[model samples]
Target: PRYLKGWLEDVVQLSLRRPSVRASRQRPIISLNERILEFNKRNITAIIAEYKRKSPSGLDVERDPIEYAKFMERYAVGLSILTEEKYFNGSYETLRKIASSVSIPILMADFIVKESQIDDAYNLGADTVALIVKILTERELESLLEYARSYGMEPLIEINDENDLDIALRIGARFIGITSRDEETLEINKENQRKLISMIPSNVVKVAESGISERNEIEELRKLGVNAFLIGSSLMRNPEKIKELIE
Candidate 1:
């Protein structure tokens, strides 16, 4: 509880202040719930496709992100733009560009730790911001989620285990992403995945986040009660792959 990864803290520092070229201005906000609900009601699989160049792991790809995001809009329920500036090789410029071009909800994903970071996200046309449970204190999480809501962006509360899950529950999180964090490597640990996912209230939008790379895995987790999938490294620059996932 007292220790955070170096990059985690470094990102917080990198994000503390901002100098920005805006994403023009955001369009009329889209309701992330309605979009997810649209997919769920229609009995279609919901994919929150992502734009990422690299990860802390060895996974790497560099290509035209704007073109890729355009394709994702056709298949995904939403899109995620990695705005963390260092190891993830992302910047707000990418987020702003994708937000301006795509019609789907865009989630600004990072080691979110401050209100200003959330403010920066909203100004850059983010429809949602990720509030990772492990990185902040209970009060900080509570304060930041509330702050994001005040700006009209719903927060995607991300949880790694039971401790993080408990925090989300107590905060009345409606959009939750359950990440399977391996101590090393970019990998998915499905061992207690069912048990952890089942703990969330059924109405909460449960997103299976990170390292998800297949259609049948989506099928399996959806059966286990996941409402959406937040995929990154595997999805970057890979749009045709969604044909396999969205059908």
Candidate 2:
């Protein structure tokens, strides 16, 4: 509850800085703009370009998040984004630069507790937005998605368990990111994560987020009905692994 109030305040401040959401026709053509949408529609794998500089686990690796996004794009991943600074570590300007450099659909990976962050994300050229359920109420999350849909921005609901999956479905988010790690510690429990993922509706494509290190891990998740993997620290630890997995 303590973090909740701080989170709400951050959302309100971010909203005031965001641009008014416009229709897709009003959006500029960029990398994966149409392709990413079509891919998600067909249940293809989608990636969220992370903008992390630090973590609660004491991981302080920062190598120009946007440049890393370039590596991800070349490796057949989805869009890039400004992970944003509030709960995590990222900057809006860094994400905007990446969006301008490549045409990939950009996502704002932040704690979206308010509609204002949605508006700001679009103005920063984000095509997709992440809605994390750990910190938002059901009504707020639903309203956030409705507002995002009206603005032509795609929403990916990030979840931690079965309950979050139900919430994701109720909110009508087709793109769901199933993360395995604890947000505060960045620790992952594989068995629990696998079970939670399997509980999700098979019709909905599964996205594995967090603690993916080896190609074997990715392959394993894929076997569990995961269509894609959204990784960060591992990639930061070994940038070459991006091309390695793609091949």
Candidate 3:
């Protein structure tokens, strides 16, 4: 967990150096949950498509932020921009630029362990910020959840097991992400996705993340009440098939 601990320390230091001010845009708030539900109503599994320049396994992906935003706007209900720099080679500038170019809700995916990072997400135009339950202690998770609400940004709380799901449920997260990959091992566990989905309350918007590629898998998850899919590697590798795969 040194990487997680190191990232936490880095954000703490960076947040001190780069304090944020309130954004001036008067745009209507976009609801990530409502958008996912809307797509479900149309029999379309909401795609919370993600953008990353590279994977931990060294697979490189390159796409212009604005163009990628435009491409996804046509097929996805929401967007997730990787803001973690060390592993993913992502940045706040990429997220900010994509948000400016796209009208859809964007989720800020980063190592957010502090209130200041949540502030940074909001000021940069993120509709939601991902909070991984496994990486955070209960107290830290609750604090960040409350802080995200203060700025009107929904927390897309992520869980990989029943324990993490319990934490998410305790916090009453409206949007829940079930990651197929273990945070520590990076191992794909599709069974964990299935096991955890049944435990989530019907009112929560269920999201399936990682190891999702083909249309059939999306269809199967849809039957299990998964409202959205947060895809990174698969889509990043073959973005041209985005529309075809989702359809």
Candidate 4:
């Protein structure tokens, strides 16, 4: 049994040490749901940027939500509450406060594995909800997106690979999170990013997630025609610097 533990750790460590992880940057592009859709319609780029307290990533950010929101507004990116831990932070209600403080659209960005979370997001004033492809099935994915729309909330689906992109396309999601990080290892890879972005139906607006850390990367992705980003580490690393970037 003890020897087996070593093998288990090896497998897990193998996943943990790989490096293709990417997160969105601290830049806002638009927030109003209708405007975001219109931006997509007009072939303009939009980013439903995220604000958080902490993440599974090493970032343990503790910034003023109001200040962040104020700075974010200038970028015109939709604001999403990605923190507020389910067990502790009262993520749903906290998001309600964020909504009251600002007028941008909000996407409840937590590990939404249950239906109750969906209800919570809607009741808490989320204009959109995020769904990750690595967790739900095609049927479940479609149903969830459809259900979100039923409540008048938009769906921003996160994808890791071609299969995930297929699921997003099948469900007709207009906002897509193209993540390059390996969830298990937190590895960062971009080889598949441009390919996936190009394959995304032109109708669906794309936002690159994970590994983004510099202006250069942002410029590169922008060139790829990615509409916006959901950055975490870089901004979380230095809130003051983020203010500069957004400015």
Q: How much lDDT does each candidate structure score?
A: 0.80, 0.66, 0.81, 0.65
Which candidate has the highest TM-score of all? 1
TM-score of 4: 0.76
In angstroms, give how far residue 33 of model 2 lies from its true place. 11
Candidate 2 — which residues are off by over 4 angstroms? 1-49, 80-82
Which ranges in model 1 have alpha carbons more than 4 Å from their true place? 17-24, 183-187
Q: Across residues 126-207, which tens digit of lDDT does each residue of candidate 3 receive?
A: 8889998877778888888988888887889999999899989998889899998887668888987899998888899999
Q: Give the TM-score of each candidate.
A: 0.92, 0.80, 0.90, 0.76
- Model 1 agreement with the true structure over 1-247: per-residue lDDT tens digits: 2256666656566665545444455586786766887898899889888888877865778889899989888889998888876778888888888898988998888777777778778888889889888777889888998998888878999887888899899998998988886423446677655678988888998998766788888999988889998877667756788788887
Q: Give the least accurate 10-residue stretch of model 3, judged by summed lDDT.
A: 1-10
lDDT of 2 by residue, 181-238 (tens): 7664456778878988888777665667877666777767777877776766556677
Error of 2 at 181 (Å): 1.1
Query: Could you tell me how far off, in angstroms, the CA of residue 102 lies in candidate 4 after the best superposition?
Result: 0.2
Q: Sort all candidates by lDDT, best to worst.
A: 3, 1, 2, 4
Model 1 Cα shift for residue 204 (angstroms): 0.6
Screening candidate 2 with a backbone cut-off below 3 angstroms (N, C-alpha, C), the clashing residue pairs are 15-116, 18-120, 30-103, 31-103, 31-104
